[PDB]
Symmetry: C2
Subunit: 390 residues, 2 copies
Amino acid sequence: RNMQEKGVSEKEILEELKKYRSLDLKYEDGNIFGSMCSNVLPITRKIVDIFLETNLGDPGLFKGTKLLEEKAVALLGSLLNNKDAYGHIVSGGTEANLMALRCIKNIWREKRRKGLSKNEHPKIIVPITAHFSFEKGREMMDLEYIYAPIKEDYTIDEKFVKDAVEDYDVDGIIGIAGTTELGTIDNIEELSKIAKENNIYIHVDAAFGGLVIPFLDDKYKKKGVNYKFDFSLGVDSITIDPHKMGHCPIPSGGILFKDIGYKRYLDVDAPYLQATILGTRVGFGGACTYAVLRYLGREGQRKIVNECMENTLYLYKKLKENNFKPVIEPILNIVAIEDEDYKEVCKKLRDRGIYVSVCNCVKALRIVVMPHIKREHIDNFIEILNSIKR
Amino acid sequence: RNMQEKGVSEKEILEELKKYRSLDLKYEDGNIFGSMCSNVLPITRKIVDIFLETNLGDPGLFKGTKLLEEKAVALLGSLLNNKDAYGHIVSGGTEANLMALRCIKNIWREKRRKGLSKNEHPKIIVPITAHFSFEKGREMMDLEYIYAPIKEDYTIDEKFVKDAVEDYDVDGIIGIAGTTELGTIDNIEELSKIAKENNIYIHVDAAFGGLVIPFLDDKYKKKGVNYKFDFSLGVDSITIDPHKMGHCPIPSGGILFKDIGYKRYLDVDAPYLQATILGTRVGFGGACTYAVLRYLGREGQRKIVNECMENTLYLYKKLKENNFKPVIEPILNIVAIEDEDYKEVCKKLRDRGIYVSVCNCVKALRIVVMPHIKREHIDNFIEILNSIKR
């Protein structure tokens, strides 16, 4: 507990650490059902070792690692239909979303300086399904949120957004491509039309879905769901998270802006003295993001994505066969189970070694069918749950 | 450049990555003289591998890794003379400083809600030597900074701070234990007295110095410099950065608060739904911080710190012997060289394979004598610099 004068041997300290690691769950063991992280692609362990002693906060010392960040951003941009994207491989979707909010706020600040805004704080339309990082941004940056309601399919109400844009002076719109709770996709096509017609910045949070949606086989796509979400719609920025469905080690997050014109709105003016929030920051995230996308190609990511979707629809089928009520038919590799007693059922599952997460907008257990979840784990989950219900 | 359909082999992608890594500098090669990062302790490569697939954003899944974060914070707290510290192993000193600023701001918000503050924004006294992360915080959180001037020894003017606290309603004070530019130590003892007498929060930025000052041999200590900076002075929070002079891999930063009473001021209220800014975040930083401090003990860190100081004073001696003007006699393992033509000299050094950094408050080259800088590198640096000056 206290700092000691004498050191200890490598064997002593590693064995102590391994005992603590033994208390953790491991993704490959069939315990973790509620996480959007999973096992990393094995090749990334070598890449982390190669790039461990780099620092993208000092890119003049690590020119090659910096070029790899640029290449990683370019490959993500290509995936998102934008060959000119300006962006960064950052610490995660939270920092990515915060940087988009900073950009929105600095566009508003410039208007305020010119007398072109009656808003004392940026006014941003955000769906109530938005990830908690948006609340962190609101709280830090003193943003004003207009919370948009969701429709019966749990996607943002586009008519509300359009009406709010007419009623108020709006500084940004947020749409979500793959919501945290249910994996639904907002109508980005319509939101982007509203945004373009009114000269409003629009950010797409595709932290999870950005590395799933582009790879979905047609049989998993649903009539009337629009899967368009990327720069082909003219959106201003997109968050996308390699350390979720990109199989990259933490920290590997992505923020892409439509072009380099946005970089100036990420400036910070220091009277007595970088676009990311962090300073010193890893170089291995960009190396891993580039390398995993190159190693797998579209073919390899498609195989993983649709294996997850196969197991997602298997879980959905088994749930209904056992008279459980999924909240929705799954869109991405996320299924939620309606249950009034969800808190207690979650704890009972936990006692039996099944770790799910629980929802906010609805009383349900959330299962994220990442690549570590196999058929036998789903079968095991159903047995344990049936047993709890007797 | 573009996303491809077909993947590539492991050999192809690793060889490509290794070519980019070949363009980087490496700490052990005698090129990097201006960085506060260095080679990691070799044991940490194994720890990163063990803990790569953990996530302190989901500590309920990684109970052991979470306990190790708590143990890492406790060891840092013990080093800083506080057995009850509440804190986190975060992404770096930037996030640490931002969390301290969030705490300061939320203490002010509570006062504002009760009518106990005439300040429309928190008013924080910050020395002009403060790290750029404080400007990032000001810009994001709409803080009002009262910039404190520095004295001839480049430390904060304590009388200015005391006078400003009488003239204005002040919500926080920042002191620096190891400035970025010169390695000087503000008079934290006096600042903490001012802060306590006026009920003002005080944060100490010891990102660099916190893992140097406690280990300095008496011969490196200077008459009249006060080396006290930690919780024995009753300060409210301290930033300390293991991935600087703690030899830990990025990301390993530290933020410690005086006690768990501060946790409530890091809350974020989400109407429709964690104390760190990041969400998903590494677990290996806490494991490495704990393990390196246990492995080295005070004895092993003292040896490294004072080896760096030996080489720092060697560099200072050689500089004067060659008629260069150091800005100050070094306090920590940082030396700066006065030069009117510092920008051009820096570029000339760069052309010769010597990478220094350059200062803000003064026209000088900054050398950070990290453990990778040995006598032969200092001798080589002096030769190249003498040559540039002819």
